[PDB]
Symmetry: D2
Subunit: 295 residues, 4 copies
């Protein structure tokens, strides 16, 4: 037997950083969870019990805190690129670093209509993520994403004209509830190294904002023919607005809300045009995915 | 042996209801999770296998949907009082109904600065809850609450002057991070029945809003001497603003963020006035509770 | 306003302890999660920012580790009584301590049919818990429990003869699946203090074992008329087997498995006596409770 | 823009099946959660709102129940291969089916030392999984795995001789606790189709059992030089015992248990050879992976 692939590192490293404006007194906080896995000439740690090739996972944890102390942590695309580059430059035998960052929301509170200088609220569990792969001699590959964005529309979703055969019981509909948790990922053109990532810094936050805005507006305004059709419209728009993106991937559950027939009870009407009370279904759920690129 | 206490019913009943304004086209959605447990002359179902005294839990589930079809579901204090009253009036041998409702957020989306007629977003996992106990001959007891409100302030929290003995290692501090998940409950004066609950309907939403506003403002503005001292200030204010409340209870975890000493690494300064990067601690956590009433 | 009730302390304190037999080389591990809340003359910490009355929650955490170092951690009824007693004896102004312990399973591995000296497996997420309330001048109250014991029987459960009215759709049945997660609590006679708890030490593990055995055998062997009837039989037996128990409480969900009518597809028969494939339902669920005491 | 990749289907489909032995009265239950995603000539559902190419996800759900009614559900490698093959044979324009199955434990109860005919217990949350990819013209690829197997050894784990530099604070050790949750996957040689999968049916359960046995014995008996070294020994053995496996992949967290220095308290000794009480750490954790194949 032989080692075909190997990677190791530290997961679930929680990090908080505060910035304090000396002039204005305003403070800004960032909180993230970081995972770093390394690859390289490490096979002998597995095959021969040779620990000499191992950067201890505890040391990887220390390096994450030190790097956050000495560099900006925003945008996460930049921080992840700095952190990954560190490992391949510092250790001759480490040839790839894989960095995943999940950013948690701490939104400034408004008190009496004015933004508070040092108080924050977690408004929803929506995340902004990055995956950064730094590979010696092959540059920096970055996938940015948003996830945990949960939405619902109460009308203006349809689903009819699908294949009907002996396995089919679903009725066609021209008016249904559509609810989903959005997972959207945009993959950047390969960057040659840290200098090139730095040169595009302003585009990272702007593209995240665009992706979010397009997602919400398209969902709200599309008279949806299917989850498939609506998600493709989202992806098209994002690609049109940022040339440095190569592909956009969406993964959307269809979280079902079922009509409840109450006609057995005193002829109560609660289906079709009379539907008011529905039963949200925890499982099963539809799952629809697509990756859109340039023609 | 004898049955000393018994209650039974249906838990985790998910319910969604939509309201459609015929004039304006605007739709509004409500989504809740409901639990109903009954008590009464039911001991023989346990001791003698006499199912004749049992309202099947499946029927309780049906009753929740039927009741939501025929009545307003907001404010939840009213819906819970209607639902509980139904069981004690309908069934001669049922003498108490216990109704718990958890309301989930579906906040109207703003698209292009304008509120959308039928699209919603889940903004955070904060809940608004009620517990309603309807007891034959003893009226209606309602406890309203908010929970899952997660906040953080980066300065203006202190903790010094506590008891020091041979079990104490904690250093006094004049500047720390304070973060918590707020659970706040206000208990209403007993109501004589449904007519009296209906007479106070406007107070329910207004008191929830007041409780939330007082919580957020006090947390943001108090130069906190301890979690104990800050939470008492919150409770005092709520009692002063609504005379029909008898007690206010707060339960607050103290979610710790620890300094990281980096001085071992090239003399890096990251403690006290130089602290920028911290380690959020998942566990353990402080837990502080208090119930405040009228003197 | 006035403080009506107050308690504070440390939650989610994870503790592991190893015992090493010097003679045999055999090692035994214990892992628990502990919560301790104190009450006493502490109202001024809330009302006047007087921290002098506060035993810091960090110190409570230290005390849990120190106590585990110096005393046996098993049975948990004893450890909880030692820990709670410590706080009321050490601090003049603390008058009650509330200790909750959750014990996690680490079961010795059998390798080649022989018990291994120092290797363990987590066999299921079933827990053994205690709640110990130590109150100055009122002795020690202990509630012991098991929870997270998940079972299923595929036949020999019935449910017929329940109340039928205009809210009822459920069909009577003489053969259904019964599945539940068992939560069972036995409350001990009040103990005068630590000496009396020590005098009964052997009864704690034996009573836990009896409670578990009775639960499993009764569930397996009863041709169940309802969840109500089966759970009462369990409670009766436990009370008969241990005189120092005052009450037994059971809380059982009824986790539904629904038949799937497949007759629409080529007349496939999958209901009643032909039922083979079922749909487990995540929610809603029945919830049945009872507390049984001595006549 | 163009569709580069697309797949869609149903997730979280819970299924239970019972087998009833007519002769002996013995019943056996199986419970699983199934996910099926399809690929094929479906791009126009995304680009042109052409639902004619869509097999509704509701129909996929129906097909899972029908297939479970008409075929054995064990071993899961076989059931997954039957289910995936169905979709590519039935629908001309569907060219790949991806089937994931998670099997939940229902272990027969022993009552009075004898196996009960129809009562079961969930012994731990360990799962047995399969991923089956059925691709038109390219056969059937199966990855089998076990996951959620949580173990701990209290001694006979070491970690010394790793790289030490200016980022390193970790002390070398010759005696530590090692605890992990095991995720192990074995990938089978490609099968030409269903006939070939059927021909190897007995090997599936036997190989799962071997993988589990090797994992547990190696963990218990290895005087571990590192997680890397121990996991490689596991993988080597599995490959040696089953020739139809091409690769074995392990993913193991290192769940840390930290010493607690109590010397500040009356000189209490609780470190090194005196360590008895430890603090389990919820996060961060090491994460070690490797894929082993044939030389
Ligand atoms: N860093 C590592 C540790 N460790 O404790 O840091 N232990 C291992 O077995 N392997 C590692 O890579
Ligand atoms: N409603 C009840 C059911 N049931 O199925 O509805 N089963 C029981 O054992 N008990 C109940 O109360
Ligand atoms: N122990 C306590 C702390 N503390 O940090 O330990 N902080 C508080 O606000 N209150 C406490 O009781
Ligand atoms: N099966 C599908 C449904 N559906 O409801 O089954 N809805 C969609 O938008 N897309 C689907 O593929």
């Amino acid at each position: 037997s032989a080692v075909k692939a190997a990677r190791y590192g530290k997961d679930n490293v929680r990090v908080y950083k505060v910035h304090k404006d000396e002039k204005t007194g305003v403070q800004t906080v960032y909180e993230m969870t970081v995972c770093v896995l390394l690859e390289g000439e490490i096979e002998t740690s597995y095959t021969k019990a040779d620990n000499s090739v191992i950067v201890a996972t505890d040391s990887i944890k220390n390096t994450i805190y030190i790097t956050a102390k000495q560099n900006p942590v925003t945008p996460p695309e930049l921080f992840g690129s700095i952190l990954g580059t560190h490992f391949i430059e510092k250790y001759n035998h480490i040839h790839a670093a894989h960095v995943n960052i999940v950013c948690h929301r701490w939104t400034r509170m408004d008190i009496d209509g004015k933004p508070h200088p040092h108080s924050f609220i977690r408004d929803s569990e929506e995340k902004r993520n990055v995956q950064v792969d730094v590979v010696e001699g092959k540059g920096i590959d970055i996938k940015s994403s948003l996830s945990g964005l949960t939405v619902l529309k109460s009308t203006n979703s349809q689903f009819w004209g699908f294949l009907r055969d002996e396995y089919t019981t679903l009725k066609e509909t021209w008016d249904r509830i559509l609810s989903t948790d959005v997972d959207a990922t945009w993959q950047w053109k390969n960057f040659s190294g840290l200098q090139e990532v730095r040169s595009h810094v302003p585009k990272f936050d702007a593209t995240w904002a665009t992706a979010r805005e397009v997602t919400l507006k398209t969902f709200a305004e599309d008279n949806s023919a299917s989850v498939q059709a609506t998600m493709y419209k989202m992806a098209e728009q994002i690609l049109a607005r940022q040339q440095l993106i190569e592909t956009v991937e969406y993964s959307l559950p269809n979280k079902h809300y079922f009509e409840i027939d109450l006609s057995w009870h005193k002829g109560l009407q609660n289906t079709g045009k009379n539907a008011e009370v529905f039963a949200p279904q925890s499982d099963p759920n539809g799952l629809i995915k697509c990756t859109v690129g340039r023609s």
